[PDB]
Amino acid sequence: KKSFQTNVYRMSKFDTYIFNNLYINDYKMFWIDSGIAKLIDKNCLVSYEINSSSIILLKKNSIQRFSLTSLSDENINVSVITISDSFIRSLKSYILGDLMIRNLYSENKDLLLWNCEHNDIAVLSEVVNGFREINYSDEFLKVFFSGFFSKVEKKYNSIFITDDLDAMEKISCLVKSDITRNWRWADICGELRTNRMILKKELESRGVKFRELINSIRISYSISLMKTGEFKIKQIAYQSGFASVSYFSTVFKSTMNVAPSEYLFMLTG
Numbered sequence: 001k002k003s004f005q006t007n008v009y010r011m012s013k014f015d016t017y018i019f020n021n022l023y024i025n026d027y028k029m030f031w032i033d034s035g036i037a038k039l040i041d042k043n044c045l046v047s048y049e050i051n052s053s054s055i056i057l058l059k060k061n062s063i064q065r066f067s068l069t070s071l072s073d074e075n076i077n078v079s080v081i082t083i084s085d086s087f088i089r090s091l092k093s094y095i096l097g098d099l100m101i102r103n104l105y106s107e108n109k110d111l112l113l114w115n116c117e118h119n120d121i122a123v124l125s126e127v128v129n130g131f132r133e134i135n136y137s138d139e140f141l142k143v144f145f146s147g148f149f150s151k152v153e154k155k156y157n158s159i160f161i162t163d164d165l166d167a168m169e170k171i172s173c174l175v176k177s178d179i180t181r182n183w184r185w186a187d188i189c190g191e192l193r194t195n196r197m198i199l200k201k202e203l204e205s206r207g208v209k210f211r212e213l214i215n216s217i218r219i220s221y222s223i224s225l226m227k228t229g230e231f232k233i234k235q236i237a238y239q240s241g242f243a244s245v246s247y248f249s250t251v252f253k254s255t256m257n258v259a260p261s262e263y264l265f266m267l268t269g
């Protein structure tokens with residue numbers, strides 16, 4: 001069970017979630033349970049409709065800019081699964097046992113879509129229900145998720161499970177290992193022993209400057225702390241490395257379109 005962190009958000013008619021410079025700290029997937037939603041991806045400048053069988057995948061270490069809008073009147077529950085790095089790395093012996101195909105894939109897609117059948121959605125639902133009803137062996141989930149990811153990578157002809165030595169993974173592991181450190185460019189270069197010229201590409205490829213990058217990682221770090229049931233916003237701001245509650249709230253509102261305490265309540269309730 002520890003391999004997954006899950007949440008279910010309610011969404012009334014024609015209301016919209018809006019995410020800007022949302023940093024994806026760990027592999028995430030989401031789907032709606034009924035009705036129709038509109039997804040506008042500002043990174044790919046595309047909009048499209050999703051239904052109860054559309055699974056949307058967000059790649060680890062991407063910077064997401066999209067909105068999700070309900071086009072139903074009946075309320076909609078959005079389920080989100082965050083997959084722990086421990087579990088992702090246990091899959092490697094399944095995805096990369098098929099590596100000669102995988103070298104020919106590209107690395108441009110951060111938000112992937114899968115139209116699946118009922119069984120796939122029954123499995124992910126039970127994941128979202130904390131396996132209260134059906135329990136699943138570690139081998140079943142490893143086979144299921146590795147097979148799921150390789151189907152989606154095949155569809156887009158692009159790698160989804162990145163590898164450890166990717167520059168942006170090194171930057172982001174480093175920042176997350178010491179969230180309250182006063183990070184500057186010079187620290188990244190010195191820890192990774194890598195020229196600014198080369199590391200720079202990972203931030204411009206994602207449309208961020210250094211400050212918005214650090215801020216996005218800290219917002220996700222703070223969202224992770226809110227999910228643990230820690231409830232004090234003032235503590236969460238300082239624990240996530242911000243210098244004031246005001247600055248944390250301003251960045252949070254800019255990223256999530258909701259105030260930190262509004263989000264903290266969407267979790268515990």
Ligand SMILES: Cc1cccc2c1[C@@H](CCC(=O)O)CCC2
Nearest residue numbers: 009017028030068078080082223
């Ligand atoms: C709050 C929400 C509602 C609907 C969809 C999505 C979200 C957040 C999930 C928050 C997280 O896990 O950090 C971002 C990904 C997709």
